[PDB]
UniProtKB/Swiss-Prot annotation, chains A, B:
<dbReference type="GO" id="GO:0016765">
    <property type="term" value="F:transferase activity, transferring alkyl or aryl (other than methyl) groups"/>
</dbReference>
<comment type="function">
    <text>Catalyzes the synthesis of N-((2S)-2-amino-2-carboxyethyl)-L-glutamate (ACEGA) from O-phospho-L-serine and L-glutamate.</text>
</comment>
<dbReference type="Pfam" id="PF00291">
    <property type="entry name" value="PALP"/>
</dbReference>
<dbReference type="InterPro" id="IPR036052">
    <property type="entry name" value="TrpB-like_PALP_sf"/>
</dbReference>
<feature type="binding site">
    <location>
        <position position="70"/>
    </location>
    <ligand>
        <name>pyridoxal 5'-phosphate</name>
    </ligand>
</feature>
<feature type="binding site">
    <location>
        <position position="265"/>
    </location>
    <ligand>
        <name>pyridoxal 5'-phosphate</name>
    </ligand>
</feature>
<keyword id="KW-0808">Transferase</keyword>
<dbReference type="GO" id="GO:0006535">
    <property type="term" value="P:cysteine biosynthetic process from serine"/>
</dbReference>
<keyword id="KW-0663">Pyridoxal phosphate</keyword>
<comment type="subunit">
    <text>Homodimer.</text>
</comment>
<dbReference type="InterPro" id="IPR023927">
    <property type="entry name" value="SbnA"/>
</dbReference>
<dbReference type="InterPro" id="IPR050214">
    <property type="entry name" value="Cys_Synth/Cystath_Beta-Synth"/>
</dbReference>
<comment type="pathway">
    <text>Siderophore biosynthesis.</text>
</comment>
<feature type="modified residue" description="N6-(pyridoxal phosphate)lysine">
    <location>
        <position position="40"/>
    </location>
</feature>
<comment type="similarity">
    <text>Belongs to the cysteine synthase/cystathionine beta-synthase family. SbnA subfamily.</text>
</comment>
<protein>
    <recommendedName>
        <fullName>N-(2-amino-2-carboxyethyl)-L-glutamate synthase</fullName>
        <ecNumber>2.5.1.140</ecNumber>
    </recommendedName>
</protein>
<dbReference type="InterPro" id="IPR001216">
    <property type="entry name" value="P-phosphate_BS"/>
</dbReference>
Amino acid sequence: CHDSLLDSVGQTPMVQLHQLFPKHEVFAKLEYMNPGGSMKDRPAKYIIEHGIKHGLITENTHLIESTSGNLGIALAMIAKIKGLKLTCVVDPKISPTNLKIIKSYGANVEMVEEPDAHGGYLMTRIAKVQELLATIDDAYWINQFANELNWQSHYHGAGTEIVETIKQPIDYFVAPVSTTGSIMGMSRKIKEVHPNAQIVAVDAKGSVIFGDKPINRELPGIGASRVPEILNRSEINQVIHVDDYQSALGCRKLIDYEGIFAGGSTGSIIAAIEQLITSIEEGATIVTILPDRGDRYLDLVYSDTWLEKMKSRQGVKS
Amino acid sequence: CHDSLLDSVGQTPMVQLHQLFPKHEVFAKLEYMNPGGSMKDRPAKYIIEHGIKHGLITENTHLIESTSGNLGIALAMIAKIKGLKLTCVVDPKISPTNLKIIKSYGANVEMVEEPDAHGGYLMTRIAKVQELLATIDDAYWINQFANELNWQSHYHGAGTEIVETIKQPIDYFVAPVSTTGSIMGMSRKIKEVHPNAQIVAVDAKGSVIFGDKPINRELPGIGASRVPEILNRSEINQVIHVDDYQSALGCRKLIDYEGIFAGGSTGSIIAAIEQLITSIEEGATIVTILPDRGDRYLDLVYSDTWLEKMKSRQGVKS
Ligand SMILES: *Cc1c(COP(=O)(O)O)cnc(C)c1O
Ligand SMILES: *Cc1c(COP(=O)(O)O)cnc(C)c1O
Ligand SMILES: [Mg+2]
Ligand SMILES: [Mg+2]
Ligand SMILES: [Mg+2]
Ligand SMILES: [Mg+2]
């Protein structure tokens, strides 16, 4: 019996993917089963509650972040529960579904209209966040790419739950990246108990997080157009890049073999573990996380016509 | 640690709605936090597993049901996990989102095209189900309106969990209806422990389940165009009808006061409990269920333009 929905954040299920990985012990943490629908419930709850506890955030404090995705939805839920104003800075590319969910939770949306000269809205949204911090008195910037509380939420969140459940040695921990909060915080907790666990980052082809050559990327959730301040690269032992097509095939294989309907970055994870398995020992124990549901990828991954277009994008292999 | 996603069906959270109901003890069972996204995980899992256990369903058995909604999605998930073929009979009114989710799980869809003479597809889908049962050898009809396993799943499911958690006397149990499996099965279990609990059905205005005058109804999930065989009316102590507008206001109030983003029939439940509270004792203990998420109601309940249209439909009150 809970007093709030907040009490059901965390303690997410762990499954073994027996059918998909018959020659390894692969455990998936179902972070998408958080009450808000994604893993971002963890940093949204943790960051806001920490700020309230330490007097940085009061009922009068206006929360700000540039996000069009899962973190915007999570922040909107937590802000509504706590009685806090929230403004999400977004751009015209936001999916109508996410926009409507964020607005349904009563958050404000500040949509930038001016692309930079070469078509992106990235620098425009960075600037808009600073404008709001200049003009809205009593504000708190979630600051997802630099806030230590992001990775700390994952250290105390799924990272702690993983090492309590998977007490046998963890040979590989595999996570997708955007802010790198998840892989930093979870790997830090895992390696306290399993110091020899290898930490494998999965990124989108074209993401600049690990210096890849930028290409047009369709899938949200995985990859970034900046190097996050949160990232400490010496803590990453292997980096696997996956393209949109590969990722989508991974999602479709996971639902076919296991009946788990997960989002794009989970497909990236599946593709990456299939690559990893060609080099590692049979029987290895691999832990990963499934951040969100397939539901908002119906016109991406789960669309056959989109899939065919992504197949055509594989450069020379197309 | 689970071997399958199926192990995470059930044991859903119970919250208290302190803010929405400050003068009563109102407990909500979050059935939408089942892994498939709605309460229909319970009958889908229970019915299929029972059939397999008793030799009515084997790997060669083709599952059939007429459903465009939550039960189709749940059946598709369970069928995929179990390795079973599924055909959902639907009509042109199916939402594109639900259609895409059911197809993503690998289920077959049989969409009827011929309305009857007065515009509905109800009799056409009833006939299509019998045609498939005539022409597909080795089939099993889920038969949601008449299958005893539907209400049994809820007796063993949330009903059992409710009486284990809420050991204090339950004064009112409030549930929405379509097949009446939920209210029948859950009330039967509740009244073993709390024989004086009053059982309150919440239906859509215009639904024929309790003999209301049919009107055009927008919201899916609640109400039916037949009297379910499953229903035993002597077990229902009070019936509250709610219209589309009322239900939508209930959803919007629940998310505003509690940060819970739930679907149409949850709004019906909220509207009905607000009515109930005008007659019952202050401080009463009320238990209810929240069957699904707000996510597929973004162009219904959570659309301001749709809400205004429903406001205009309230007959003389408009
Ligand atoms: C947040 C997110 C990630 C990446 O997590 P970070 O902690 O930001 O590195 C991957 N997939 C999805 C769907 C996400 O929401
Ligand atoms: C199934 C369903 C109901 C009604 O439940 P029954 O057991 O069929 O009476 C109400 N709301 C939603 C969203 C449902 O999926
Ligand atoms: Mg002010
Ligand atoms: Mg970026
Ligand atoms: Mg045959
Ligand atoms: Mg009907």
